[PDB]
Design a protein around this ligand. Structure first.
Ligand SMILES: [K+]
Ligand SMILES: [K+]
Ligand SMILES: [K+]
Lengths: 163, 163
């Protein structure tokens, strides 16, 4: 299936405190049956929660993707999360659900390429930020807004349009 | 013609430790295929990195200018950086894209002249600071802030407004 933007957004926990769809990182992991503090000790990379949040939104809208972190609690117990942003972007890139991303190498090209569309965005190799960022993006007041945060100071912007 | 402020900013590496867009001098030069240590030995002036950073931001927003350091690596290989702040300011001043800067000769006139606008700023002949400083400036909580640092304690402030 191909998820609709509105429903993917409804099913996506934002990390932005002022977002209507906000949920704290600890609560996101608790839902899937993990203690964040425990995971951080195993791999500090778990502090970057964008791909966990996006994985969960995709699962909730019925989208297939390979994952590495088993869900241990709730309706999605047994299903898997991909906690790495790049690895999740790779999955989307090779999927029939989403197809190949449009990839932009500078800010003007990224903004023009996205234009008035909405969908999934992946900011790859962000300046002064570890692990990248995958999120939802849409126009707002003639600018682009991300459900959590945009990171246009990066090496590559990947975009998948949704309806 | 002129680049959009937000896109120029997204394309600009800050030298402010606290900036979300911070990249250290070593990494800046490494991107364009240079070793900072080597350049410093050729000319200690290379320690002032503001014009290299601004040069990169201009290239990434498709703005043409005369430079003197050929890029050896990446998307802009073959094109030049201008490492000198005054010389870069000269190029913008005579360009058809940016046009003539508004030039202020004291700090209060500069503050009032820039006001609540945003764009490119050049601080010429800064007290107790060698090489000048070219940067991005914008209001934040009704106070002007530079992407790296402001230096209003100088002989001349040049300003190009951007949208
Ligand atoms: K955030
Ligand atoms: K996040
Ligand atoms: K050039």
């Amino acid at each position: 299936m191909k998820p609709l933007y509105r429903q993917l957004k409804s099913s996506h926990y934002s990390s932005d405190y002022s977002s209507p769809g906000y949920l704290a990182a600890e609560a996101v992991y608790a839902e899937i049956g993990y203690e964040l503090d425990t995971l951080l000790k195993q791999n500090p990379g778990y502090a970057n929660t964008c791909a966990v949040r996006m994985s969960l939104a995709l699962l909730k809208t019925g989208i297939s993707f390979k994952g590495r972190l088993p869900i241990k609690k709730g309706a999605y117990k047994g299903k898997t999360i991909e906690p790495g942003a790049k690895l999740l972007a790779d999955q989307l890139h090779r999927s029939s659900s989403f197809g190949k991303a449009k990839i932009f190498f500078n800010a003007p090209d990224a903004e023009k390429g996205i234009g008035n569309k909405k969908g999934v965005v992946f900011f790859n190799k962000i300046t002064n930020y570890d692990g990248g960022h995958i999120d939802l993006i849409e126009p707002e007041n003639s600018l682009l807004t991300c459900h959590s945060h945009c990171y246009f100071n990066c090496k590559e912007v990947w975009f998948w349009e949704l309806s």
